[PDB]
Design a binder for these strands. Structure first.
Lengths: 124, 122
RNA sequence: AGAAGGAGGGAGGGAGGA
RNA sequence: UCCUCCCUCCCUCCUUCU
């Protein structure tokens, strides 16, 4: 029954409006950490269970970070970019300087590292 | 440690009155009391705070970390009308799935005189 | 996406008081 | 002229939670 990083992203993506929003990014981060730790299934199941509770798909993504334990243990991934323009418009409003040991299950999706040295966290 | 006392501790930390966390405090202390686990629940509450967690966070950690809250259904609370539910919880009401889990944020189930049931969901 | 708390503000309904 | 209570609705700020 095992699912693919490919189609999970597909599914979760089907469920959200907009393009390149903080939640599309969060989908990407969840699936990557998903693959590399062999939890794409645990993760799909929590996504479904949260929709059953009545959670908006945004909220469901959030529940994964808070309920699937891997995400309390892997830091938000660093993503090397040139400049802040490279980040999608929808995410612009959600960038914040990151504090020490930023946690995914606290809303820190990823860390954008630009070529001027400045790092900006994507905060949900 | 006592149920009455611990509720008052937990409350003294919470913002507002009549919020979902106030309801959760009552559920936690009720379950803790029926089951002789107030000591465990209090320790975990204090432990969360020491890690620097918000009191709201600490209550959630109890539901996730003290195993009893994985193994019992959300309490059924019987009420006259929906208007009997405090203002702060109103926007948090929603229909429960079949086996709502307390450790999934389902604080309790309000059963009205009409037989209709809404879960309080955090 | 949504909720709670505090703060600032703007519009309109019902009532009561100075 | 002002105040209080309740009911809609709109904007911004801080914190918390899912």
């Amino acid at each position: 029954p095992y699912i693919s990083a490919k189609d999970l992203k597909e599914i979760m993506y089907d469920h959200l409006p907009g393009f390149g929003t903080a939640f599309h990014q969060l989908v990407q981060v969840i699936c990557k950490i998903g693959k590399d730790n062999n939890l794409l299934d645990t993760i799909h199941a929590e996504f479904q269970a949260s929709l059953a509770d009545g959670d908006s798909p945004q909220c469901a993504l959030i529940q994964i970070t808070k309920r699937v334990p891997i995400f309390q243990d892997v830091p938000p991934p660093i993503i090397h970019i040139r400049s802040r323009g490279d980040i999608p418009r929808a995410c612009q409003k959600s960038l914040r300087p990151a504090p020490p040991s930023p946690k995914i299950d606290r809303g820190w999706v990823c860390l954008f590292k630009m070529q001027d040295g400045k790092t900006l966290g994507l905060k949900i």
